[PDB]
Amino acid sequence: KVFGRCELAAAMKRHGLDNYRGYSLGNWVCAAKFESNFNTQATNRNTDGSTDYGILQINSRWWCNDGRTPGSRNLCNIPCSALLSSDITASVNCAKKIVSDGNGMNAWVAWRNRCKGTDVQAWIRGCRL
Ligand code: NA
Ligand SMILES: [Pt+2]
């Protein structure tokens, strides 16, 4: 599913990401734009053999089981395919564990490099939230 910007903002808000660990909703919408282009089906292979999955590009190295990342962890206790659903619940629930783990949104390379320190409130402008 490719979300619209305000459509994703509404879903992320409903699932409790606005101000989650102090990150405003615009931070999460910006992170999903640059991680996945708002596409729940996005997948990208990492150099270490792991893969990033879904609208927030969650890594099989630590967070999910994809059956091809040997020696890895599954800290969200899910198959990585759960992170590709049109329903973002599994991605949002897993993102909450990631952002809680001590590095905050720096875990998302695209957030660090393209969102951090920018006018992230622009990402929710015009939306009826
Ligand atoms: Na894993
Ligand atoms: Pt939820």
* Domains of the chain with CATH codes: 5-124 (1.10.530.10)
Among the bound ligands, the one closest to the CA of 46: 1
Q: What is the DSSP letter of 80?
A: G
66 is catalytic: no
Centre of ligand 2 to C-alpha 91, Å, is: 10
Structure obtained using: X-ray
Catalytic residue among 7, 18, 48, 52, which?
52
- The two three-digit tokens of residue 97, written as one number: 């564990």
Contact 28, 17 (CB under 8 A): yes
Backbone φ and ψ for 99, nearest 5 degrees, come out as -70, -20
Centre of ligand 2 to C-alpha 127, Å, is: 19
119 is catalytic: no
Contact 97, 73 (CB under 8 A): no
87 marked among binding-site residues: no
- Cα torsion at 85, 43, 15, 94 (round to 10°)? 110
CA angle 118/116/21 to nearest 5° reads 120
Whole-number Å distance between alpha carbons of 70 and 66 = 9
